[PDB]
């Protein structure tokens, strides 16, 4: 079967690079049951707090490469190297990027996620998991890949929605909990599958606002990724505790944690 190129760019020119779609597996058409958006949207009043006087910001007169940058100090257990790659000390990490209130320039060293997608990605048809996303180039460890983009909703709204296959919990620790639902509006990340041996990790980030209800979700590679490799992250135990009643994991890894056999083995261990 020929691998048919079925869309030149599912993002319609909204990303820095096109994201084509191919299907060399079956007759499924390019997915159109959602609206591609490159940035989060709202379908009710969220009214993000963008008060420029509310932003913590730096006074750097350099490129924000020094440890004296306030924005770098606010970041929790992570930092960017000179090439824009994320390093972590391993409480989850939290990135405060520079913003419109900082004295620094738009091209300072603390601007990775807000600068958008730089790697070549492809939406493709997987053998067993529906659509997936793969790299069209080698990607070094720590590289920004893409953001989890969708519809901002409250946790109460997330609990009542019927299709939970695209729901990302922001897991707010101080205040009400919010979610990003990519079922109806989303970007390329809605197609990233779960892998028990993941090669990307989600990290919460603040950029042009510091409204604590709404960290933005940035995926970074957790190891060097080879051309053609499917991208995947660990959806987490909570997802699988709910979804395993309907389907089990087909990642195929020797260390798979969510297959029918793994679940039975975990039930025996407990």
Ligand X SMILES: Cc1c(C(=O)N[C@@H](CCC2CC2)C(=O)Nc2ccccc2)[nH]c2c1C(=O)CC(C)(C)C2
> What's the rounded Cα separation, in Å, for the pair 74 and 204?
13
Question: What residues contact 229, with CB distance under 8 A and at least 6 apart?
Answer: 134, 135, 199
78 binds, among ligand X, Zn ion, a second copy, none (CB under 5 to 8 A by kind): none
| Cβ atoms of 155 and 54 closer than 8 Å | no
Residue 256 assigned as binding residue: yes
Interface with a second copy (CB under 8 A), residue from 74, 101, 212, 263 = 101
Judged by beta carbon, residue 13 or residue 236, the one nearer Cl ion is 13
Pick from 191, 201, 202, 199: which is nearest to 253 by CA? 199
CB atoms inside a 10 Å sphere around CB 86: 24
Q: What span, in angstroms and rounded, lies between the C-alpha atoms of 131 and 128?
A: 9
Which C-beta is closer to ligand X: that of 228 or that of 236? 236
Chosen from Zn ion, ligand SFG, Cl ion, none, partner binding at 110 (C-beta under 5 to 8 Å by type): Zn ion
Binding ligand SFG (rule: CB under 6 A), the pick from 194, 204, 209, 216 is 194
Rule CB under 8 A: is residue 42 a binding residue for a second copy? yes
For residue 139, what is the DSSP state? B
- Does residue number 205 form part of the binding site for ligand SFG (CB under 6 A)? no
Q: Where in 228-257 is the site for ligand X (CB under 6 A)?
A: 235-236, 238-239, 242
Q: Per rule CB under 8 A, is residue 35 in the interface with a second copy?
A: yes
Q: What are phi and psi of 204, to 5 degrees?
A: -75, 140
Whole-Å CA distances, 220 to 5, 82, 84, 189: 27, 16, 11, 12
193 is in an annotated binding site: yes
Least distance from C-beta 102 to Zn ion, angstroms?
3
Question: Does the footprint of ligand SFG cover residue 16 (CB under 6 A)?
Answer: no
Q: Considering the complex, what minimum distance in angstroms separates the CB of residue 4 from Cl ion? A: 14
Residue with tokens 């609990």: 159
Residue 56 backbone dihedrals phi, psi, to 5 degrees: -70, 140
Question: In the complex, which residues of this chain contact ligand X (CB under 6 A)?
Answer: 92, 164, 166-169, 171, 202, 204, 217, 235-236, 238-239, 242
Query: Which residues are annotated binding-site positions?
Result: 58, 60, 64, 69, 71, 98, 102, 104, 108, 129-131, 166, 193-194, 196, 249-251, 256
């Amino acid at each position: 079967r020929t691998e048919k190129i079925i869309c030149r760019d599912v993002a319609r020119g909204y990303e820095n690079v096109p994201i084509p779609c191919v299907n060399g597996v079956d007759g499924e058409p390019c997915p159109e049951d959602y609206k591609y958006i490159s940035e989060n949207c709202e379908t009710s009043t969220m009214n993000i707090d963008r008060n420029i006087t509310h932003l913590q910001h730096c006074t750097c007169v350099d490129d924000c490469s020094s440890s004296n940058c306030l924005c770098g100090q606010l970041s929790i257990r992570c930092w960017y190297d000179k090439d824009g790659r994320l390093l972590q000390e391993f409480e989850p990490p939290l990135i405060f990027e520079c913003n419109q209130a900082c004295s620094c320039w738009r091209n300072c060293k603390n601007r990775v996620v807000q600068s958008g997608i730089k790697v070549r990605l492809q939406l493709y048809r997987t053998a067993k998991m529906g659509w997936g996303v793969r790299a069209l180039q080698t990607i070094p460890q720590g590289t920004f890949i893409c953001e989890y983009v969708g519809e901002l909703i409250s946790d109460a709204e997330a609990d009542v929605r019927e299709d939970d296959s695209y729901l990302f919990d922001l897991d707010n620790k101080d205040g009400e909990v919010y979610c990003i639902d990519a079922r109806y509006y989303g970007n390329i990340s809605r197609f990233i599958n779960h892998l028990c041996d993941p090669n990307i990790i989600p990290v919460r980030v603040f950029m042009l606002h510091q409204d604590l209800r709404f960290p933005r979700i940035a995926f970074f590679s957790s190891r060097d990724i080879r051309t053609g490799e499917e991208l995947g992250f660990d959806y987490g135990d909570r997802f699988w505790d709910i979804k395993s009643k309907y389907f089990t994991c087909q990642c195929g890894s020797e260390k798979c944690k969510h297959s029918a056999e793994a679940i039975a083995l975990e039930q025996s261990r407990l």
